[PDB]
Design a protein that fits this description.
Number of helices of chain B: 0
Shape of chain B: elongated
Number of helices of chain A: 9
Radius of gyration of chain A: 19 Å
Shape of chain A: globular
Structural class of chain A: mainly alpha
Helix content of chain A: over 70%
Main location (chains A, C): cytoplasm
Oligomer: heterotetramer
Distance between the termini of chain A: 48 Å
Organism (chains A, C): Homo sapiens
Subcellular location (chains A, C): Cytoplasm; Nucleus; Secreted
Strand content of chain B: under 5%
Order of helices and strands of chain A: HHHHHHHHH
GO cellular component, one term (chains A, C): nucleus
Radius of gyration of chain B: 7 Å
Bound molecules: 1-(3-bromanyl-4-methyl-phenyl)-2-(2-bromophenyl)imidazole, calcium ion, chloride ion
Largest interface: A-C, 23 and 23 residues
Largest sheet of chain A: none
Strand content of chain A: under 5%
Number of strands of chain B: 0
InterPro entries (chains A, C): 14-3-3, 14-3-3_CS, 14-3-3_dom_sf, 14-3-3_domain, 14-3-3_sigma
């Protein structure tokens, strides 16, 4: 649908959509930009991530509201409407996750050769499989969970070899993989260990950073600390 | 509550 | 698109969509309910209003962001993208207003015989013409403004004859007509006069109300006072 | 700022 718009115009419009809090539009513009077939710059990758995280974040929040209402109903024997509407929102959410995973597979990941881009996209792949796992209940749920795990693990392996422990994408990846362990894989000890080791190794590397890099890294470290406080 | 994943 | 769903199921799903903050879905469910052809109850009218006010409210906020960016551009000679995207959001907004006005015209207003329903729908008609007027610039702008004025005026005439001065729909109508005068019709003195007379006549009628009705009426009176403080 | 219209 965006095939007739210039790549640069799609990027410009994605930035305007962000300013206007029109995240569905922002995601459609960035999907159009990805489909031009060129690699994405650092800023462009962030626009893609922000757009879809906001879209799927609203869907996940709505799914959780409806799932809670449905659970309370299954404990007055009301009709099919709550389940039907939860299923409608769930199918929409799955469609957005499949769209993002499709962009990563065709062909963002295979062309990403630098560590920063490859880790970024593998983290995204883990995240969107994690969102699929949050709603999964059927024959393929274990395979969805393993797909998230595998993507996060490859990203971790690259990040530990190629990036300093304070690198914001490395930190955000570890944060999200720890959430995966706690919330999805039923491995709270692994989640806590990962968050603590990540925090401590970043702390020891802050001395190398400029004031601006220090601000970026410590912001994510605080999220790790917030989870450790919640979990311990 | 739910834990914090990455967010800006 | 909602033709195969039961009226009661559409209403139930609109309430679930409200709880999940899925206002586009809520509006689609309520449009489906209106199109069943039966009159709407008091609660159902409020669901219809809440749904579309939230949808169009997000569009208006985005339009204002983009219009401000476009104005700053027209004072580096950038390309067509800001105007194009503002126009896209504007066309979407106009489409939602036309949808609401179409429901009112086919056939909510003509079947509304009680003062409460008729005033409610005429207030809505004024509001959605007012939102069209906020973005209007062409040959028909004066006619759009007059359409808003005419709908508000008929609602006012009925409300003054058939409702007490504290009735919440009467108060909200007067609030919105005063905003029309200030923001759309370039009549700040008329806006101030209307807000003051409405506030004073409601104050004099509070003594007749129960505690719960008093709370409803004074909430809207405070909005009138907030505007008077802003305008004087 | 902009004035207040009806809102709940
Ligand atoms: C998942 C994650 C973690 C950190 C960031 N982040 C924070 C500050 N800069 C960045 C960043 C990292 C990689 C590419 C672009 C950017 Br703006 C972002 C994300 Br999605
Ligand atoms: C425009 C307006 C003004 C007041 C209300 N309101 C406030 C409390 N109850 C009501 C009301 C009025 C008429 C029908 C239903 C309801 Br819940 C609502 C509105 Br849209
Ligand atoms: Ca490459
Ligand atoms: Ca009737
Ligand atoms: Cl549904
Ligand atoms: Cl556009």
């Amino acid at each position: 649908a965006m095939g007739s718009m210039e790549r640069a115009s799609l990027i410009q419009k994605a930035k305007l959509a962000e300013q206007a809090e029109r995240y569905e539009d922002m995601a459609a513009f960035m999907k159009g930009a990805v489909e031009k077939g060129e690699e994405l710059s650092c800023e462009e990758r962030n626009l893609l991530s922000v757009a879809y995280k906001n879209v799927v974040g609203g869907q996940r929040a709505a799914w959780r509201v409806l799932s809670s209402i449905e659970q309370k109903s299954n404990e007055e024997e009301k009709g099919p409407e709550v389940r039907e509407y939860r299923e409608k929102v769930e199918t929409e959410l799955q469609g957005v996750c499949d769209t993002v995973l499709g962009l990563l597979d065709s062909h963002l990941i295979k062309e990403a050769g630098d560590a920063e881009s490859r880790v970024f996209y593998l983290k995204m792949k883990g995240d969107y499989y994690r969102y699929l796992a949050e709603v999964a209940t059927g024959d393929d749920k274990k395979r969805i969970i393993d797909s998230a795990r595998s993507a996060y693990q490859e990203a971790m392996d690259i990040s530990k070899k190629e990036m300093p422990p304070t690198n914001p994408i490395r930190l955000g990846l570890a944060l999200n993989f720890s959430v995966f362990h706690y919330e999805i894989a039923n491995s709270p000890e692994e989640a806590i260990s990962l968050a603590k080791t990540t925090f401590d190794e970043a702390m020891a590397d802050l001395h190398t950073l400029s004031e601006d890099s220090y601000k970026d890294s410590t912001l994510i470290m605080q999220l790790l600390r917030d989870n450790l406080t919640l979990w311990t | 509550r739910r834990p914090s994943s990455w967010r800006q």
